[PDB]
Amino acid sequence: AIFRFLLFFQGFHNWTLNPFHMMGVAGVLGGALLCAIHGATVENTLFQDGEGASTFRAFNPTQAEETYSMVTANRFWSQIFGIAFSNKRWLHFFMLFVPVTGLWMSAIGVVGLALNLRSYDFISQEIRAAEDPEFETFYTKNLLLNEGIRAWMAPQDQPHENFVFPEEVLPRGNAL
Amino acid sequence: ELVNVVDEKLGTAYGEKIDLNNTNIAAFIQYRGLYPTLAKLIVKNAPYESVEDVLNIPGLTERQKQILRENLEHFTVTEVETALVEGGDRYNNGLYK
Amino acid sequence: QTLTYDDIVGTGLANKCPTLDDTARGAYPIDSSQTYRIARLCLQPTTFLVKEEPKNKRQEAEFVPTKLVTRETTSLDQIQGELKVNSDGSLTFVEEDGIDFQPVTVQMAGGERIPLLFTVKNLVASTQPNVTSITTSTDFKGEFNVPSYRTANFLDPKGRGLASGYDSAIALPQAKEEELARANVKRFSLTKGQISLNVAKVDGRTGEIAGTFESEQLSDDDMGAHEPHEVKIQGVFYASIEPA
Amino acid sequence: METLKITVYIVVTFFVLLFVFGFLSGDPARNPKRKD
Amino acid sequence: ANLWERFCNWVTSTDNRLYVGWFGVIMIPTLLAATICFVIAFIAAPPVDIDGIREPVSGSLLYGNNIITGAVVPSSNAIGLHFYPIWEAASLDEWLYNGGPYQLIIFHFLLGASCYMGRQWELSYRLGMRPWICVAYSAPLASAFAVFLIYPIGQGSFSDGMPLGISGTFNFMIVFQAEHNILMHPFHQLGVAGVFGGALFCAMHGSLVTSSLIRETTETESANYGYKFGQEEETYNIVAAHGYFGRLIFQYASFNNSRSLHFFLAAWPVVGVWFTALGISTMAFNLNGFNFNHSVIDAKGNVINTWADIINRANLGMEVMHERNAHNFPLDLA
Amino acid sequence: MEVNQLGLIATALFVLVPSVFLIILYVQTESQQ
Amino acid sequence: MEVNQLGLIATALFVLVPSVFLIILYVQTESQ
Amino acid sequence: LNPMWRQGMFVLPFMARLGVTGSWSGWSITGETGIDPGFWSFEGVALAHIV
Amino acid sequence: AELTPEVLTVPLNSEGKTITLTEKQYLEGKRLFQYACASCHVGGITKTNPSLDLRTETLALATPPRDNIEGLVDYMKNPTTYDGEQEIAEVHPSLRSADIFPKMRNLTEKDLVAIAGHILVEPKILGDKWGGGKVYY
Amino acid sequence: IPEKLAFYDYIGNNPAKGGLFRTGPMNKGDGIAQAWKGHAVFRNKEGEELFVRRMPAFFESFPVILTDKNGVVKADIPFRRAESKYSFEQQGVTVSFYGGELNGQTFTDPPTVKSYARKAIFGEIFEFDTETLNSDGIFRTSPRGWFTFAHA
Amino acid sequence: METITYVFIFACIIALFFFAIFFREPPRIT
């Protein structure tokens, strides 16, 4: 039912075109990135604090020592990527900040979709497209798709409306 | 002045009867005895100036002439419309199911 | 000797018409009491020239060159039709069937793409009278049909079309509809073109002929959306003759 | 166009050669602890 | 001190502002090629016949695109999986029409990212680190291979690879769902769980650490000046952290070994993204998502719809409309 | 394209106003040193 | 009145750019 | 009737003046269509100045 | 709604005799149809010739009529084209062509009636969905 | 019927037909309303009166489907023309206006009748001035909509 | 004008990359 909700929003609201969703995507994916990259950095800059091959045992919850080298991690990432973190407090605040913010942003976009205040069209494109049958973008291609979704899904998804679409009115491309 | 010629055609007998000059071949399934054999023949030998002209197709068994006779009232003829006969669209007009 | 698929595949030779040896200067005689066909007609363009529009009025623009951007997809071939002898001894080829169209797009200086349906559809071409023999001086001249580049089911990027599609600019729901009429109402053109086939090689032993061709036809008009350009095509041809 | 093809075939061969001979030039020994 | 040996010593120097290395010897030119062709194409490439039907699609800014709708358009279906370098085209005008830049960019880019990954192992070796950060990066790298290479290989055409553009991306993920019901595929579901899960734990770890910083500053100063680069003692108290989260849920659903906690952080999103990379890669071979269409019926044989059929209605409208001019026959088999 | 004309002044100020704010704060931070 | 569109952006930057320069220079004078 | 100087072209005449005259698009400011200017076209002079 | 005998009563021949199937036959038919036929005829369409479906109304206007158990059983023995003008066992699975369509080899005579019976009952249950295609999925 | 009441019965004043970046007054979209053209009555060749199925607020676009009093579809504008049963051309559909600027006027030629059928899904049919504000023809939301959005 | 704007912002971001790597506040120890 949630999957259907996802696809409702594409065809009716064109929700992928919405910058507030895009900033949400960037915050969720930014979070999963930071999660993976931070776990991996710590785990591959560990200090040798025990003899054994399982490096988990050589951590004590009460040691005051940091258990990995922030310094060797900073060098690694400075030389690999060009910048690294240098402040372990900023790093962990940034890990809070990114995914929280992203979610808050998508929320604001949904609030607008409550009112059907969609980010549905680019006017300049529709104006040229209408005047110019040779002008096609991935933007015009995606609205044919949403137009399909609407017409093929609406009668069964909104049964209270008694939508009757006879075959001849359903938007379809050639052969399919 | 700019019209859709396909839409204009739907306002002629083409929109009610099988048009011997224009209709895709799959419409001959709506009547028995017609598809595929006679339908193949009618489409190959179009166009026709009158509905009755179908009976003069060379090679028609006398049984074939009677299946056409029974069905002449479901036929008709209008001017050939280029948009419906170009492309081999009388054999395949891109509609399946 | 003839080659196999695996010999030819990926070379571009599949897009080339058969050649005749430059010794083939014979003549092929025509028994008006016989009928003949063309077992295979092959047309291979080599040049695409487009007519420019020169702004003023009494200058008339020239034909300019273009670049082909659709690769080795240009030749017509496997064409066949009746070859007739008329009262006066003229010969008339009548195209029956074949791969008689190729979509092509060339690009003018300035990067305008010009698409066209290169074709000899419904070619009826005829010689002088009193031929009596096909020679290296025989010239066919004929006209053919140029149907619309897209057929009736074709949908433009807003879902508009002729036998299918929307009848308006649905993205502009309360827009002034008259100014979009030309773009909303699709029209199916059907024009004529001219062709000349100049025979320069004849193999009297085998009824094969080869020569040069020049045709004139209109370009794509995008279902009535813009005005077409005038196109000149030059190339070579091959044809095989046969008794019926 | 053919000239271009030559130039790219040469460029690529040169960088791939660099790569292979680079790693055959004692690469395990290039670390900060144990060299052999 | 031999010529070759000085060179080998610069390539592998850990003193270069950016590390080069042997993997870098391949990565730098391949990524400079991809980058320079991407920027130039996004700004100025003319329209591309992505689907082989002589219906060019405008991707670039000077041709009426904006940052959202622009793309480098995939190469023509007419080419399918054929290799289309520049020197195989009769001219650059042809190569532009048929989508050659996309092939040039994606191939250079794949190579250079493959080498980015090795470069990550290489520097870890030169610095005396453990080696496995590159295994973490293998999940995105795998995901990029999936949508630029594998999925085209399996469908037969680079024209069904992912466009290099924001709206192009959405096109490709819409059509993927009509053709593969990827939402109902379990490996995509783990990907969502991998990516929702990593966003959650990102925020957890960063909120719990931030919650248990040790007072080092005043209220007039950023708490971040409590930490100095390379200080030897931890800057938060992990037992206060364990004691909070263990009481929020219960004691044993909270960590207190920081090594296990960070390995868990690393492993959850990496594994979930491996799977979703596998999903795209196996749907490349049309082993599609679960199909529950008409699975529920009544005593007579009436269909009783479920949400799965509602999804299918949606999928159907996606199917019948994509590449609307492109199919002459009733089954879109690839 | 028939793009909205205040798009430009909107974009230019959206960029310039907060950028200048940060530049002002940074420069006068550094001359405290 | 049918005025120039770019006139607004030319006027606004004409004010904004040189003013900001002076503001940057003045505030960092004061904080030293 | 629409030469460069009616079109507000400032630097195009200085490239024209010393012998650059054609575009990689295939036009030239002397009306010739179908010319191949090589690298030193209007576009290539611009790019080289960026580099 | 349940699978009642009214719905399970199908014409037997063109003279309009009728035959009522058990539930067992109906499900046997549904099994055998999936084994031997659905690969082309899932839903009552024909994947390799969409112009011809198994809607009862199309079967009714087939020459020899096929809207009955006899016509259908015959068609499985000796398929023809829609006008009955030529035999198509070369290219359509049938008992007469089980040499080349091996799944037809082990179909007894009762199997054929269950298949025929399944095809005439199913449009009564599903209506337009049978032969309708994706529009009605 | 007061024109003021007829104007409320028009989807272009529905605050849920807007867009986030479609700026300015509603007038910038459908134009400045000048006149109620009249209430439009569709009939087929049988004399049956037909009804345009109104667009709901969710849909940026909507098919043109004419129904009878009893809900039964009797005409539409077909997308695919080849198997069309219900087209205006085949069904002989006509539009008659009562009230307003077109009171007493009847149109029979199909391209005109489809034209008003298209606007009838918006409800009552109005004459707009699109030149004055260079209106682009795309619905915008009202102050009711913009206030709710900001304050939520 | 919109193309100039999109490309100008992109170019400014590439410029900031350069400064942020080569002209960063250098990390110093204890």
Ligand SMILES: CCCCCCCCCCCCCCCCCC(=O)OC[C@H](CO[C@@H]1O[C@H](CO[C@H]2O[C@H](CO)[C@H](O)[C@H](O)[C@H]2O)[C@H](O)[C@H](O)[C@H]1O)OC(=O)CCCCCCCCCCCCCCCCC
């Ligand atoms: C950043 C941090 C690290 C530092 C990095 C170091 C800095 C180095 C950065 C350098 C990068 C520079 C940017 C490269 C621009 C690419 C130029 C191009 O694509 O330029 C190509 C140009 C353009 O070609 C023209 O391209 C045109 C394409 O037009 C298109 O474009 C037009 C607009 O321009 C119109 O829109 C037109 O409609 C549209 O179709 C036409 O096809 C013309 O016929 C065609 O001539 O071609 C030519 O003439 C060029 C010459 C090639 C001719 C072939 C001869 C072979 C010579 C090959 C040389 C190989 C290089 C050596 C390698 C190394 C060995 C030491």
Ligand code: CLA
């Ligand atoms: C790369 C792909 C991608 C990514 C990363 C995202 C990411 C996101 N999308 Mg988009 N989406 C995409 C593609 C993507 N989207 C596409 C292609 C479409 C089609 C248009 C959509 C359609 C879409 C819609 C329709 C919506 C999103 C939403 C979201 C957000 C969900 C936030 C969240 O955690 O909700 C998870 C939910 C919560 C965090 C709510 C609270 C959950 C509580 C804490 C759980 C309690 C559990 C409890 C203990 C019980 C457990 C028991 C039970 C599990 C058994 C997030 C920003 C949503 C959004 O923006 O909302 C603001 C939204 O509604 N997306």
Ligand code: CLA
């Ligand atoms: C809430 C809704 C939701 C959510 C959370 C997700 C989440 C996800 N989806 Mg799903 N999806 C949804 C709805 C949703 N989807 C819907 C509704 C549809 C159907 C319409 C889909 C259709 C769909 C498809 C078709 C695909 C996904 C994929 C994905 C994944 C995208 C992230 C990824 O690939 O990481 C992986 C990481 C990367 C791709 C990054 C590669 C990084 C490279 C190596 C480096 C790039 C460098 C760059 C160019 C330069 C930058 C640096 C420079 C600026 C300095 C993720 C698991 C994708 C997937 O599984 O991909 C494998 C995929 O193909 N989804």
Ligand code: CLA
């Ligand atoms: C509660 C506030 C409020 C509300 C509801 C309105 C409502 C309205 N105004 Mg007024 N107005 C306001 C405040 C408000 N105004 C203020 C403060 C000013 C001075 C700036 C004006 C100046 C003004 C003028 C000059 C005009 C209007 C007009 C209008 C109408 C059209 C609005 C429109 O198209 O917006 C479009 C809305 C948007 C484009 C949305 C902008 C928000 C963006 C998307 C977010 C910004 C990015 C942000 C940083 C997100 C990232 C953050 C992240 C890091 C967390 C409408 C009735 C117009 C009218 O019709 O006149 C009669 C008109 O010409 N208003």
Ligand SMILES: CC(C)=CCC/C(C)=C/CC/C(C)=C/CC/C(C)=C/CC/C(C)=C/CC/C(C)=C/CC/C(C)=C/CC/C(C)=C/CC/C(C)=C/CC1=CC(=O)C(C)=C(C)C1=O
């Ligand atoms: C040529 C033309 C003109 C160009 C066109 C190109 C074009 C298409 C581009 C489009 C660009 C475009 C519009 C972008 C869209 C982006 C968009 C959605 C914006 C997001 C905006 C927004 C504010 C969203 C809210 C959510 C938000 C705050 C997300 C932030 C995302 C973010 C920056 C996450 C971090 C990702 C990242 C790679 C971090 C690396 C972290 C890192 C340095 C780790 C290294 C590291 C780890 C350790 O553990 C330790 C110990 C140390 C020491 C250490 O170092």
Ligand SMILES: CC(C)=CCC/C(C)=C/CC/C(C)=C\CC/C(C)=C/CC/C(C)=C/CC/C(C)=C/CC/C(C)=C/CC/C(C)=C/CC/C(C)=C/CC1=CC(=O)C(C)=C(C)C1=O
């Ligand atoms: C008619 C009548 C009267 C009817 C009868 C009805 C009746 C009266 C009903 C009333 C019943 C009654 C009153 C209620 C009592 C019943 C009760 C017990 C209810 C159940 C409550 C309930 C449903 C709870 C929901 C369960 C819940 C969601 C728990 C989920 C557990 C779980 C999945 C948690 C995640 C665990 C996990 C591994 C997280 C890791 C996160 C992460 C990596 C953290 C990072 C991190 C972790 C650390 O650890 C530390 C250290 C640090 C540094 C750090 O970074």
Ligand SMILES: CCCCCCCCCCCCCCCC(=O)OC[C@H](COP(=O)(O)OC[C@@H](O)CO)OC(=O)CCCCCCCCCCCCCCC
């Ligand atoms: C060989 C080539 C290798 C690849 C080169 C790629 C270089 C790209 C990296 C960008 C450098 C600029 C970052 C400036 C910012 C910068 O200077 O950061 C520096 C900052 C240093 O953190 P410290 O902990 O040192 O500082 C905190 C203290 O100062 C407290 O005030 O690091 C970050 O916070 C890490 C998070 C940045 C994570 C986001 C950056 C990545 C986003 C990149 C996507 C760009 C958008 C593209 C749009 C088209």
Ligand code: HEC
């Ligand atoms: C593809 C390999 C098929 C299989 C397996 C089955 N059928 Fe079929 N069927 C197929 C085609 C291409 C056609 C059209 C034949 C023609 O050219 O006329 C048919 C036709 C039928 C019909 C007639 C439908 C009508 O409207 O008249 C029937 C009744 C039918 N087929 C039945 C049937 C049965 C019972 C099958 C399983 C034993 C079966 N078919 C398999 C293609 C294929």
Ligand code: OEX
């Ligand atoms: O190309 Mn892109 O997209 Ca995979 O299927 Mn077939 O092909 Mn096209 O349709 Mn659906």
Ligand SMILES: [Cl-]
């Ligand atoms: Cl598509």
Ligand SMILES: [Cl-]
């Ligand atoms: Cl196909």
Ligand code: NA
């Ligand atoms: Na059943």
